[PDB]
C-alpha cells in the first residue's frame with residue numbers, strides 16, 4: 063500500500079519502523095543521541111550514496127558507484143535504492159531486529175534475499191551503497207562491534223575500550239568540579255549507576271573534519287568549584303529555573319530532549335522532491351553525527367559535573383525551593399540530596415551540551431538549505447501528554463511554534479537549564495560549536511553533491 | 521473459562537498473570553529474589569489469611585478475621601477469597617499493573633470495584649485479608665514506598681535508605697576482599713554499574729523470627745585476599761567449573777537461577793486439596809522471604825567479592841581456559857578482564873548464596889510437609905532452549921529430575937559454582953541457613969493453622 067512512483071519511502075516505510083525499533087532497543091525516551099544519530103547519519107548517508115548515480119553530478123561519500131542516465135531517475139528508483147541501503151545499514155546496526163528489516167522490504171514488495179550489487183539497478187545501487195557504509199563504519203572507532211583492542215569474547219556494542227574512569231562514585235562527591243554518575247532506577251526496585259555512554263566517541267572517525275581537537279570549546283570555568291562565586295551562581299540559576307517551571311518550559315525541555323520527537327516537528331521543512339529531501343537529510347544528520355563526536359571529545363576532556371552534583375555539594379543538609387517531582391509543582395522543602403532535574407539527566411559529563419550543539423548544527427544546516435533564518439517547527443501536546451508528568455502537564459492543550467532558526471536554538475539552550483540537566487554555560491558554548499559543524503557538514507555534502515570527493519571516508 | 525467449584529485460583533487464574541507481569545516489570549530472568557519473593561510471600565500469606573476462617577482453627581498472620589461455618593469452606597469460596605486478597609496485594613506491590621489486576625478479576629466474573637470488608641462473605645474476607653497484608657507490609661523497612669527517612673519526593677520503590685556504599689568501583693579493584701559492582705549492558709550501547717539491590721533488607725521485618733541478626737553465618741575466610749592460598753584455590757574452582765561446563769550443569773544453573781522456572785519444577789508437588797495447597801505455599805514462600813532477609817543481612821555484613829572480581833585481580837593480564845561466552849564452548853584465550861560467569865552475576869555481594877539458602881529453605885519446608893526426603897522435581901528443556909545460549913544449549917531435548925530434597929539442594933549449591941556467580945563456601949553456608957529458616961517458617965505457619973497466634977505481624 064505504498065506508491066513507489068509518488069510516496070517518500072523514508073516517511074512512509076522506513077521511519078515508521080526504525081523509530082519504534084530504536085525506542086524499543088535503546089530507550090523509550092529517544093535520549094541517547096550518540097546512538098540514535100549514528101543510526102540516523104548512517105542510514106541517510108546510505109540514501110545519499112545509493113542515489114548518487116541518479117543525480118547529474120553527485121558522487122557518494124562511502125562509495126563511487128558511477129552514473130546512470132537521467133531518465134532512470136524515477137521516484138520509484140530512488141525509493142528502491144533507499145530501502146535496500148537502509149536494509150544493509152540497519153542489519154548492521156541492529157541485527158537482532160532482522161525480522162523487522164525484512165518486513166520493511168516485504169511489506170512493499172521487495173525481496174530481502176536479493177543481495178545484488180549490479181550498479182545499473184536500483185537494488186544493486188542500494189545494496190552496494192549500504193554495504194559500503196557498513197564496511198566504512200563498523201570499525202570506525204566507536205566500537206559498534208565491541209571488538210576494539212582485539213576483544214574476541216563477551217563483545218558488547220559500543221563498550222568503552224579507552225579506559226575512561228570517573229573520579230566521583232555515585233555515592234560520594236570526592237570532586238565537585240568533575241562528573242559524577244547518577245544512581246538511577248526505572249521504578250522496579252533495581253538501581254544502577256550511570257556509565258559514560260560511548261566515552262570512546264571522541265576517537266571515532268568524523269565526516270566533515272579530520273580531528274575534534276580543532277573544535278575544542280573553552281574550559282567551563284564556572285564549573286571549577288574553587289571559583290566559588292561563579293560555581294554557586296550557575297547552580298542558583300538551575301534551582302530558579304527548576305522552582306519557576308512553566309508548562310511551556312516543561313514541554314520545550316521535553317521536545318528538544320527526545321531526538322525523534324524533535325525531528326517530528328520538522329514536517330514543515332520537507333521538500334517535495336525526493337532527491338532534495340535526501341540531500342538535505344544527509345547534511346542535517348551528518349552534521350548531527352559529527353557534532354555529537356565533537357561534543358563527546360569536549361565532554362570527555364573537561365569531565366564537568368551535572369547540576370545535581372553541584373546542588374548536592376553546595377546545599378548539603380539544606381532544603382530547597384524547587385520542582386517537587388511528578389505532579390507536585392514547586393515545593394519549598396526539597397532536600398538537596400533528593401533534588402532531580404525535570405528531565406532525566408543523561409549518562410555523560412555536563413559540558414558542553416550535546417542536544418544544543420545538535421540543535422545549532424541543524425539550524426546552521428537549515429539556514430544554508432533555505433537561504434535564510436525562516437523555518438516552521440511545530441510541537442503539539444494534548445493536555446496531560448507530557449512524558450515526565452503524564453496526566454499533569456500540560457494543564458491545557460498546547461501548541462508551540464518556531465519560525466526562526468535562531469530563536470529555536472536559543473530555546474533549545476534555555477530548555478536544558480529548565481530541564482535541570484545543564485548549566486547556562488554548556489548551552490552557550492554549544493551554539494558556536496553546532497554552528498561550525500553544521501556548516502562544515504553542509505560544505506562536505508555539497509562538495510559531494512557537486513561531484514567533488516572530499517575527506518577520507520574513501 | 522475457570523471452574524470456581526473444582527479449579528485452583530493460583531494455578532489457573534493468578535499465576536499465569538502475576539508471573540509474566542513480574543517478568544515484564546522486574547526482569548525477563550526471574551533472578552531478583554528479594555523482589556520476586558516479596559510478591560510471593562505477600563500474595564500467598566494473603567491467601568492464608570483470606571481462607572483461615574474456613575479452616576476449623578486457623579488464625580491469620582496479618583489479621584484475625586474470625587470463623588466461618590464449616591459448610592462455607594467450599595472450593596468456590598476459597599478461590600473467591602484468594603482472588604480478592606491477591607487483588608489488594610498486587611494493587612499495592614505493582615500499582616502500574618492496575619489494568620492487569622482488574623482483568624484478573626473481571627476474567628472470571630468478579631467485580632474489581634467491590635470494596636466489601638464483610639467477614640461473612642468470601643469477597644469481604646479476601647479484601648480484608650489483603651488490606652491487612654498491605655497495611656502491615658508497606659512500611660516494613662523494605663522501603664517499598666520509597667518513603668523511609670522522611671523522603672517526600674522522587675520516591676523510588678525499594679531504594680536504599682541505610683547508606684550502603686561499595687569500596688570498589690566498576691572500573692578499579694581497590695580492595696579484592698570486598699564486593700565490586702559489575703559493569704553491565706543488555707547489548708544496547710548503554711552501560712550501567714550494578715547497585716546493591718535492597719541493601720536495606722537486613723533491617724526489614726521478618727515473619728518467623730524477630731531479627732536476622734541472630735542468624736549470622738560463619739566468617740568467609742577464603743574471600744580475604746591477603747589469605748592468599750585460600751583465595752586462589754576457590755577462584756581456581758570457579759574457573760575450572762567454567763572451563764568444564766556441560767549441558768546438564770548449564771541447565772541446572774539456569775534452573776535454580778530463575779525463581780519462576782524453579783517454581784515450575786514443582787508440578788508433582790501440589791496437593792489437590794486447595795486449603796492444603798495454600799498452607800504449604802505460605803510456609804514455603806514465607807520461608808523464602810525470611811531466608812532472603814537473613815541472607816541479605818549476611819551479604820551486607822560480609823560485603824564479599826564476586827568471583828569475577830577475584831579473577832580479574834589474581835589473573836590480571838593473563839589469558840585463561842574458561843567458558844568463552846554464548847556458543848563459544850571452552851576456549852583457552854579468555855582475557856582475565858573479560859571473563860564472565862555463565863549466568864549473569866547478581867547485583868549484590870557474594871557471601872552467602874541467596875538462591876541456595878532459598879533452595880535449602882524450600883527443601884526443609886518440603887520435608888516437614890511431606891514426611892521425609894522424598895520429592896518429585898522435574899525440569900525439561902527442548903533443544904536450544906537455554907536462556908543463556910538460546911539455540912545452542914542444550915544439544916538434544918533434556919530431562920532433569922530430583923527425587924531427594926537433599927540431592928536438589930546440593931545441585932543448587934553446585935549450580936551456583938557451575939554458574940560462575942559464587943564460590944563453594946557461600947553455597948555451603950546457605951545450607952545451614954536455609955534449613956533453620958525453612959523450619960522456623962514451617963513451625964510459624966503451623967502454629968497459625970492450629971489457632972495460636974505467634975510473632976508480631978498483627
Ligand code: VO4
Nearest residue numbers: 866873874875876
Ligand atoms: O542469588 V545468589 O546470592 O546464589 O548470587
Ligand SMILES: [Cl-]
Nearest residue numbers: 278279280491
Ligand atoms: Cl567556547
